[PDB]
């Protein structure tokens, strides 16, 4: 069957640059036209290059032209794409799709963050109280978990998309709608190794 | 470049329903147009190629029509998994664009939200900043405006709203309306006021309180 296996992006900060990948297999590699498509944070899909199977030329959208490169290994079945001068706008899920313009196999999504931020784990404040929850401020990069009394309570539970704030930092509220017991707010920042356990008191 | 015009941009609707999904090419695309189906932490998924040509492994109640500049798409009797955003995507030339994408999302009764203040933690204000936050939870449709009074000052550049997906159980949405403030700042002023606008409140609902 069609596959395409994508590599691992990466963390960068403006003007940097990374390189991510695709190893196809179960088609005609060597002859087929392969292309990058873009998607950011609550934007739409969008279109970033595409390599030609029979002749290697290449095609890429202006806002990438003499940025990023895309390349291919015929030997190894390797798409790549060679993300140079990274920019904020940069930030995306990444998929290495089969064809030109007809998209029927797409690689898992690779994300690319691009930001002049440095890890932080996030400062967990209580939203007192009916409704209480917490506050998850100030943390990078994405993502974070938030779970109630270690994952008991798991009803009621709106725990809000993270918002990129003006400071470059991220930030999401947790909230629960209790009746009339404690509750503790359980949250997780893998990129900086951080677990906060957070009780909400009235 | 080719514009990619979509319509609608959210389509209320529900399960069982056969619904028609319209894409506008700014010039001539001929055929050459795709449809794509995408659901959050999925990767898109084809749905119709060449304009009308039902994509290979696309369910059978995806349809296809048009040609020029004015394309369709239709989904006879929608599934649940049917409610994601739909693009449309000409690759008749170079760059090849896709629309900004139609919404399908639930349709259900109207709801008013149930709107809720808090202000800042003591602990938060020991750190040189201060946020208020202001819920509306479980409302229909998703339309909500939320307005933020300083000591009867409307507020501009220093709120952020985020707001969550449809309710798997009620099909409603939560929203989450934050206000910045410097620690200074906040103690400059008294009322803090969170003024919601609904299709469900007869009368705007202001949720307040005092420093
Ligand atoms: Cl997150
Ligand atoms: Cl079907």
């Known amino acids: 069957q069609v596959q395409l296996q994508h590599s691992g992006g990466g963390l960068e900060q403006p003007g940097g640059s990374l390189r991510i990948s695709c190893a196809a297999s179960?088609?005609?590699?060597?002859?087929?036209?392969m292309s990058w498509v873009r998607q950011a944070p609550g934007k739409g899909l969008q279109w970033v290059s595409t390599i030609i199977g029979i002749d290697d030329t290449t095609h890429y959208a202006d806002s990438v032209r003499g940025r990023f490169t895309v390349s291919r290994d015929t030997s190894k079945n390797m798409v790549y794409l060679q993300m140079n001068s990274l920019r904020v706008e940069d930030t995306a899920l990444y998929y290495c799709?089969?064809?030109?313009?007809?998209?029927?196999?797409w690689g898992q999504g690779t994300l690319v963050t691009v930001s002049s931020a440095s890890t932080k784990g996030p400062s967990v404040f209580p939203l007192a109280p009916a409704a209480l929850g917490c506050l998850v401020k100030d943390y990078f990069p994405e993502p974070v978990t938030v779970s109630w009394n270690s994952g008991a309570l798991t009803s009621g539970v709106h725990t809000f998309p993270a918002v990129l704030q003006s400071s470059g930092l991220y930030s999401l509220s947790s909230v629960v709608t209790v009746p009339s017991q404690t509750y503790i707010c359980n949250v997780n920042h893998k990129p900086s190794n951080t677990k906060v356990d957070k009780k909400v008191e009235p | 470049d080719i514009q990619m015009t979509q319509s609608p941009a959210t389509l209320s609707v529900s399960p069982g329903e056969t619904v028609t999904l319209s894409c506008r090419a700014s010039q001539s695309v001929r055929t050459n147009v795709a449809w794509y189906r995408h659901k959050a932490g999925q990767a898109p998924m084809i749905l119709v190629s060449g304009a009308s040509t039902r994509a290979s492994g696309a369910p059978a109640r995806f349809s296809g029509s048009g040609y020029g500049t004015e394309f369709t798409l239709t989904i006879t009797s929608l599934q649940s998994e049917d409610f994601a955003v739909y693009y449309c995507?000409?690759?008749?030339?170079?760059?090849?664009?896709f629309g900004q994408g139609t919404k399908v999302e639930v349709k259900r009764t109207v709801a008013a939200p149930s709107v809720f203040i808090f202000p800042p933690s003591d602990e938060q204000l020991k750190s040189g900043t201060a946020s208020v936050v202001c819920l509306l939870n479980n409302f229909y449709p998703r339309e909500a405006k939320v307005q933020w009074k300083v000591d009867n000052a409307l507020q501009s550049g220093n709120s952020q709203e985020s707001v969550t997906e449809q309710d798997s159980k009620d099909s409603t949405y939560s929203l989450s309306s934050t206000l910045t403030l410097s620690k200074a700042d906040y103690e400059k002023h008294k009322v803090y006021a969170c003024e919601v606008t609904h299709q469900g409140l007869s009368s705007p609902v202001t949720k307040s309180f005092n420093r």
């Open positions: 179960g088609f005609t590699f060597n002859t087929n036209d």
């Open positions: 995507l000409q690759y008749n030339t170079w760059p090849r664009t």
């Open positions: 799709v089969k064809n030109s313009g007809i998209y029927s196999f």
